[PDB]
Design a protein around this ligand. Structure first.
Ligand SMILES: *[C@@H]1O[C@H](CO)[C@@H](O)[C@H](O)[C@H]1NC(C)=O
Lengths: 48, 45
């Protein structure tokens, strides 16, 4: 109740922090993935 | 009142059509040859 701790010297420290910001933008085509080059599959896909 | 799209036999837009001449009112060899039906024909006269 009558003792304190006061520092007499100091230091300067540099710390690194890595943070993500963005990710890859992906585009997906329903044609040439589901049916490929197939007109028979492409005819049935028009209802979706 | 719908926006319907379909796959069928159609005449393509901005396509080139052959011109044939017809009009005894027949001055410049007006005649008709045998043409090709194919899978569908558009006839405008
Ligand atoms: C007419 O159109 C067809 C198909 O677009 C093409 O192949 C042809 O060369 C054209 N002819 C002329 C004279 O432009």
């Amino acid at each position: 109740n009558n003792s304190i701790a006061i520092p007499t010297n100091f230091s300067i420290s540099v710390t690194t922090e890595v943070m993500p910001v963005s990710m890859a933008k992906t585009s997906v085509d329903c044609t040439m993935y589901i049916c490929g080059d197939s007109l028979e599959c492409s005819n049935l896909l028009l209802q979706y | 009142d719908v926006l319907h799209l379909t796959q069928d036999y159609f005449l393509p837009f901005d396509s080139n059509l052959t011109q044939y001449f017809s009009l005894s009112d027949r001055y410049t060899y007006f005649d008709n040859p045998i043409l090709d039906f194919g899978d569908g024909v558009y006839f405008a006269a």
